[PDB]
Design a protein around this nucleic acid. Structure first.
Lengths: 235, 299, 50, 43, 235
RNA sequence: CAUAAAGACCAGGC
């Protein structure tokens, strides 16, 4: 309600100009004495392990059977190609698993923009150079598989058998499902109608691209609303 | 009292003029905040009173360092005291020991900037309770002199004021004991002579019509200084034989009549208590009155 | 005697105990020296009046 | 069964602190003897 | 809904055994990695200034005119009696102001149980000793007045005139309206069907008695629900 | 809006 003059006639002017899915300048005003560091540290506490995401789990390559072979028509090795596929960020709206179609022959540096566009898959970095291709029918094809997880679980306890039934040629890859990369906060002051000693907590947020920052901070906001009903009941 | 003791906190209160020490041991009959009456059995033991030594405890007066000296009693009803036993407390004493400050939860940490050289940080709870709220007493003294035209009177007829300024003053200019004054309220009812000189000749001519004392005054009353706001705990009465103390003044005439009659009744209770108890052991030696002595009064 | 009577004293051992921040909250590094210090307030002379 | 007071440091006080006002009361009281005779000071 | 297995089939077994109005052992299970200290500190952040209460504002005494007089028939002074009236906790259900009736003569230590019971006033501490009374017609009477506030506002800016119209004998008293006194939290672990590394955040709550802990934590819960609709709208 | 002088000496903070 309106109540007395502490914070009740003090609106929080928190507004939006969006950069697509990877970084956002988050602004905040006004909050009173000593309210910057607990904000940055509590949503550094939540936004590192409590956030699910969709990362790279297990990649199938062509006739190259394991990670340390060679392919006729490529300069780099398959280990550096898969290393370039580890850093590839992908967004999946509402699918549990999806297989990404990729094929390109001839000369030309294949980037992430050559991936066949799906209705629920959007590439955040089309400029990511993976490997350099040459002549003499250098046909490369991959099947990128995306699964849901949260945070880091190692590749020795999860161990998965997609193609470990009789046709083989897959092996499990380390997965970093954690979306939130960096949050940096500035602690300048603000002023509104009620009181003067009020802190403006401007945030530089950085996300890899697996989960959008709006949906992630809304999920972390309702998780926070689920948190502080702890002091409620008796016994 | 400090959570670390030395052995000197109890001797400062007893040895100095801080803790009241009884002169002779007796039986306590009544206990008040301003006085502790001690019924010392100088005669045969009876609940009828005895060689009363009344003890005046200095309650709320001004020291040199603008503080107060307090003396709170501790002896309850029906407690036989000893010569050397404590009777009341001091300005900081708990029972007999010295207790200057307090014990609060301390935590050594550079908090955020504030405790830079010699700064002390504390939560909101320290002002929500009166744990460090002390009593500061300031004297507003002003010394009486004479005037060129002729010296003064008493009345509350002060011009150039409001109604709330003269509301806390009586009919005689002295503010009451226990009035919620603030910055702006008149404590001291002074007004200032204009004389024949400061008046214009037009009000010399109509002050050939109004009065010898009709427009002789202008307001320069002694008020509360700007910023401080307290209450009145003590007023002063000082008058000199010559120049006719006011009447009506009905409350000054009523006040120390009411107080002085009680001052007679308590002193006749004390001396009546001290002499009739003395002759009771004289009269019992040689006779007895069981039914006849407790009917007539103690005088 | 102090190290003999403070390994006793409830709660901590050897003086220092993990507190929690009133602002951040988390598991506080380096248990600190806390307790109940007998402090003392100085008087208000008329110098401190504005 | 009798034990020790058991405090910090074994220094038992056998004679407590005297009247702290003996600088004032003895010098003034011996100085001007209101109840006693004339001696020591004014005299 | 049921969704995937993160927290959705994880009920919070938060139950009630009530101690009347002053302290409550609050239990909680289960919450995952790093969820104890942010709980204790966020509802230490809310439950110190955001909570209204009803405390002692201004007390009228009998023919004793100010705080530093004496009364015929009492041992202690009026300042210690009013100091005992500062710590008296009182609950008011739905009244703005109420006057409490108190009268007792003769010998006997008057406690808070001698207060005349009102239909909306309940005393939490009847054992509170105020002062010691004696013989010789020691009649004491007070009019306890209760007003609504929040948190600490000093007695020099509020200044109130109830009896400061022509009959006088009232003066303003410092008021601590803040109900919540102490919350201490223990951070042992819990286990439920889904996952194992789950924290049991057991709380020792302490309240003076002005506002009940159930109503206070429900008000702070819906205030928290009013808080985190901040990240919602654009601009 | 006008009045509480000036000077001496002492105590006090750093």
């Amino acid at each position: 309600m309106q109540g007395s003059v502490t914070e009740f006639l003090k609106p929080r002017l928190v507004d939006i100009e969006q950069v697509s899915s990877t970084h956002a300048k988050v602004t905040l005003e006004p909050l009173e004495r000593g309210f910057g560091h607990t904000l940055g540290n509590a949503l550094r506490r939540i936004l590192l392990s409590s956030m699910p995401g969709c990362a790279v789990t297990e990649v199938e390559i062509d006739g190259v059977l394991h990670e340390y072979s060679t392919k006729e028509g490529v300069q780099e090795d398959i280990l550096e190609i898969l290393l370039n596929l580890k850093g590839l960020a992908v967004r999946v709206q509402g699918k549990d698993e999806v297989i990404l179609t990729l094929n390109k022959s001839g000369i030309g540096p294949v980037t992430a923009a050559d991936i066949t566009h799906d209705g629920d898959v959007e590439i955040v970095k089309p400029q990511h150079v993976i490997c350099h291709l040459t002549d003499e029918n250098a046909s490369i094809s991959m099947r990128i598989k995306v699964q849901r997880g949260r945070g880091y679980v190692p590749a020795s306890t999860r161990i998965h058998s997609e193609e470990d039934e009789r046709p083989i040629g897959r092996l499990l890859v380390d997965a970093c499902y954690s979306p939130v990369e960096r949050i940096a906060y500035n602690v300048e002051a603000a002023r509104v109608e009620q009181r003067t000693d009020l802190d403006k907590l401007v945030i530089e947020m950085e996300t890899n691209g697996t989960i959008d920052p709006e949906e992630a901070i809304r999920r972390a906001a309702t998780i926070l609303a689920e948190q502080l009903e702890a002091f409620v009941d008796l016994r | 009292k400090p959570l670390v003791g030395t052995g000197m906190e109890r001797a400062v209160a007893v040895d100095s003029g801080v803790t009241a020490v009884a002169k002779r041991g007796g039986v306590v009959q009544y206990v008040d905040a301003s006085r502790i009456v001690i019924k010392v059995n100088e005669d045969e033991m009876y609940p009828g009173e005895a060689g009363i030594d009344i003890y005046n405890l200095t309650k709320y007066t001004r020291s040199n360092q603008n503080t107060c000296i307090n003396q709170m009693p501790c002896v309850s009803l029906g407690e036989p005291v000893e010569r050397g036993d404590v009777l009341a407390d001091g300005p900081s004493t708990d029972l007999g020991e010295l207790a200057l400050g307090q014990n609060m939860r301390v935590a050594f940490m550079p908090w955020n900037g504030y405790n830079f050289e010699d700064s002390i940080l504390v939560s909101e709870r320290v002002v929500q309770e009166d744990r460090f709220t002390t009593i500061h007493i300031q004297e507003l003294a002003c010394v009486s002199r004479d005037t060129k035209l002729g010296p003064e009177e008493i009345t509350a007829d002060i011009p150039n004021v409001g109604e709330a300024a003269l509301s806390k003053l009586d009919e005689s200019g002295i503010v009451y004991i226990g009035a919620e004054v603030t910055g702006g309220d008149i404590l001291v009812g002074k007004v200032t002579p204009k004389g024949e000189t400061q008046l214009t000749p037009e009000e010399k001519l109509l002050r050939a019509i109004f009065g010898e004392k009709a427009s002789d005054v202008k307001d320069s009353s002694l008020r509360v200084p700007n910023g401080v706001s307290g209450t009145v705990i003590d007023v002063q009465v000082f008058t000199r034989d010559g120049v006719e103390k006011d009447k009506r003044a009905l409350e000054i005439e009523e006040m120390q009549l009411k107080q002085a009659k009680k001052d007679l009744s308590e002193e006749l209770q004390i001396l009546e208590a001290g002499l009739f108890s003395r002759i009771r052991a004289v009269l019992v030696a040689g006779g007895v009155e069981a039914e006849k002595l407790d009917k007539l009064p103690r005088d | 005697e102090i190290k003999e009577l403070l390994k006793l004293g409830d709660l901590p051992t050897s003086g220092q105990i993990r507190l929690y921040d009133g602002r951040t909250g988390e598991q506080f590094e380096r248990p600190v020296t806390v307790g109940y210090m007998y402090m003392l307030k100085l008087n208000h002379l008329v110098d401190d009046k504005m | 069964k009798k034990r020790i007071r058991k405090d910090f440091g074994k220094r038992p006080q056998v004679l407590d602190v005297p009247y702290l006002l003996s600088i004032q009361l003895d010098s003034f009281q011996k100085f001007i003897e209101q109840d006693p005779e004339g001696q020591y000071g004014l005299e």
